[PDB]
């Protein structure tokens, strides 16, 4: 062979490993240190490219996909996180009593179109609410939401998820829960006018909404009639809708 071949360098170790099982086990198990713990990505970034233990980072330092196990922020958020998808469904159906906890979610539609038909159109796609709930429960409390119609799809609804701060971190647990819950949708990271936003839009075959029990629309409206919104949140939503009006996400 022209060049000492593979295993030529690796030959003694492998003979020794054939001789010594325990040392082989120790060696193979010892390879637990990842050489690359974070890697830069570019927007628009599809979050579907991230595996279960990947976390996401967005800031003036750039955008990075990182290993959650080697993440200090993830480590910090780690103790309070435990998943209840059936519970997600339960929260969606029984949201009527618990509207209070999800006020901003409704405020958005209430800001754009107070009509019953609009709220109905929003309730047509539960996975959006699944997204908002997972994000909120994941420590991303001050997230704001926007609703637009899908131009590249027929009768489909798009949801923008706008973050408040100039630095955003999505935990790997939260990310995994998010991708798991919104199986019917695709989520892409973007930046628009210095604002980090997650774009959630419906994808492919089948309508997921058929596989979740219907919910009362007029009753939620009736309940909403009593509710007192912040009023500053609603105007905030007005300017947010105004700002993202010319925002045009790319083709699927």
């Amino acid at each position: 062979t022209l060049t000492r071949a593979a295993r030529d360098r690796y030959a003694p170790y492998f003979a020794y490993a054939a001789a010594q099982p325990s040392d082989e086990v120790t060696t193979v198990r010892g390879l637990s240190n990842p050489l690359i713990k974070t890697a830069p990505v570019t927007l628009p970034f599809d979050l579907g490219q991230a595996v279960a233990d990947n976390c996401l980072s967005l800031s003036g330092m750039g955008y990075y996909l990182g290993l959650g196990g080697c993440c200090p922020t993830c480590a910090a958020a780690e103790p309070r996180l435990g998943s209840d998808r059936a519970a997600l469904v339960l929260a969606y159906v029984q949201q009527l009593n618990s509207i209070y906890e999800y006020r901003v979610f409704l405020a958005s539609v209430a800001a754009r179109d107070p009509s019953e038909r609009a709220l109905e159109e929003v309730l047509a796609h539960p996975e959006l609410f699944f997204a908002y709930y997972v994000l909120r429960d994941g420590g991303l409390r001050d997230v704001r939401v926007l609703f637009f119609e899908d131009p590249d799809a027929q009768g489909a609804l798009m949801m923008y998820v706008v973050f408040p701060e100039k630095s955003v971190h999505v935990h790997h647990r939260v990310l995994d829960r998010l991708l798991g819950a919104c199986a019917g949708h695709r989520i892409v990271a973007h930046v628009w006018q210095t604002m980090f936003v997650l774009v959630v839009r419906k994808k492919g075959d089948g309508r997921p909404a058929d596989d979740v029990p219907a919910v009362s629309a007029s009753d939620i409206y009736c309940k909403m009639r009593d509710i007192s919104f912040d009023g500053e949140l609603l105007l905030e939503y007005k300017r947010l809708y105004a700002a993202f009006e010319d925002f045009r996400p790319p083709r699927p």
């Binding site: 062979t1 295993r7 003694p12 170790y13 492998f14 082989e24 086990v25 010892g30 490219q49 991230a50």
Partner: protein, 168 residues
């Protein structure tokens, strides 16, 4: 013996190997199958297995492993030679994430692994950086990440290498 070695290697994890091939004429057929069911998180010492297979043979060969999404589980198939039918993973050292849909496959040959290794600037000294596969089975999808892993204590590794050298 190879199956025994492989089970010994995978004893750390929960992956399951399916149960007498010969070195001078190595088989073109599949030589081992490893299975991981839904919801499982496990790592596969890919490069180690490849290098082991190449050590096993006494003739020049290009060891290859295929990863498939059966549609209920993840399957690993072992070959001493890469089949014409066999796919390859479009990855780099920095961006190594692959998502498998149902019935879809990916693969890694040892040679192209060496190419990725050299392109990445990865350390080629033995057992200093070994490509492994982080595998999260999440039906309908199989999540893969081909990450280079380093030893916990390098010193210990060298000592071991030294001993191994003394044996010959």
């Amino acid at each position: 013996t190879l199956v025994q070695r492989l089970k010994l290697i995978l004893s750390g994890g929960n992956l399951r190997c399916s149960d007498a091939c010969d070195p001078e004429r190595p088989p073109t057929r599949c030589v081992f199958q490893v299975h991981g069911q839904d919801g499982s998180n496990d790592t596969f010492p890919l490069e180690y297995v490849l290098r082991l297979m190449r050590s096993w043979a006494h003739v020049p060969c290009d060891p290859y492993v295929r990863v498939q999404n059966t549609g209920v589980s993840v399957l690993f198939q072992g070959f001493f030679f890469r089949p014409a039918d066999a796919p390859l993973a479009a990855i780099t050292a920095e961006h190594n994430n692959v998502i498998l849909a149902s019935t879809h496959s990916t693969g890694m040959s040892l040679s192209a692994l060496d190419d990725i290794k050299r392109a990445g600037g990865v350390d080629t000294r033995p057992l200093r950086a070994m490509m492994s596969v982080s595998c999260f089975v999440r039906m309908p999808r199989v999540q893969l990440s081909f990450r280079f892993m380093g030893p916990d204590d390098a010193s210990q590794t060298q000592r071991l290498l030294d001993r191994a050298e003394l044996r010959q």
